[PDB]
Amino acid sequence: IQKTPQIQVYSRHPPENGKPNILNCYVTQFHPPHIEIQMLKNGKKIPKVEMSDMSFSKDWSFYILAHTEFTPTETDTYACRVKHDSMAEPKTVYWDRDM
Amino acid sequence: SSVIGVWYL
């Protein structure tokens, strides 16, 4: 009745510590369309996160792009936390600068 | 130009 979201967390531009960038959290293959997606800095919810508008693919599943301004550093950690009804527990994906 | 529904499901 529902599909389990696939998640990718990555920067819009190649990362350089100290340089303003944009962090993306691309979530696809989910259904129903209601979903909660949070972006985290050091365990804390980031206030200003933009969400693209509702879209779905030819297999009927929905996808959305959440993104936020961020400045990668040596020590801060960033992650995306997704909770959807097809998942018993929220899934948290950390940003890896190499991916 | 979008299509419209007439008869319902």
């Binding site: 009745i1 529902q2 599909k3 696939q6 990718q8 990555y10 819009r12 531009h13 190649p14 944009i22 993306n24 691309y26 696809t28 259904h31 129903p32 369309p33 209601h34 693209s52 508008d53 509702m54 879209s55 779905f56 030819k58 009927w60 599943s61 792009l65 993104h67 190499d98 991916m99 | 130009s1 979008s2 299509v3 419209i4 529904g5 007439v6 008869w7 319902y8 499901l9």
Partner: protein, 276 residues
Amino acid sequence: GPHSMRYFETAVSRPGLEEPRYISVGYVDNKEFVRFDSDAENPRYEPRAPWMEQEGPEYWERETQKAKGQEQWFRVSLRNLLGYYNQSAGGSHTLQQMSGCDLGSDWRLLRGYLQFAYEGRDYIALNEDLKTWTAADMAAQITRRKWEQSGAAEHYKAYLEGECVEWLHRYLKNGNATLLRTDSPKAHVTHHPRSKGEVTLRCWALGFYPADITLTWQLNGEELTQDMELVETRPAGDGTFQKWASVVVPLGKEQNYTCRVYHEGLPEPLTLRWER
């Protein structure tokens, strides 16, 4: 070359007295060009590609009025389905629809599409003959019988062979330059520690458009598909796409591997290898 147009519609009912939310998105060659959303302050179809600004007020007004009708059609259809499936009120339900046409190389209709899904699963679809229906379960056979009796397929056939084609042609002329544009990928390779004497070489393709692209890693010039790690193509968020492919290479023997990137914007496929 071939082209297409599609309208993806969604209606979601929600717990409470609150009416369903209706969203309609139009695409030309898989590129969003118009959108309507009943949750908006002033709900109406809005351009989503610069070249649609060429259309006048009567266009937006007519499309907006069609959307208002659709929002009611979906409410009625959602209520009908609750009964077909024996569902009570106070639940969350989704009805979706994809409609549109595909043009061949001669720019003539190649195939018409008209399909629905309920709760994310196929419900009913118009067959390629644009005359008969394929119902996915017992509830949909109800709609199928109802539509064969009403002759609904004729209505959709008229749209798919007429209006859909006519307007797709107009949109291709209006957004000609824009729609066939290509942004070549910018590529580079990064080197990663990985394990014992083995490193990871990762080939990045960034800033490209359209999303279609192919990345390949080669061993001394010979293809190498087997243990290649790929990532699904992803939006950078500025309208361009990204993608990477990596392989674990024995330390030292880096310069022996080459990555080849193929994309329609490129004058020749890109060829590169570990640098630095």
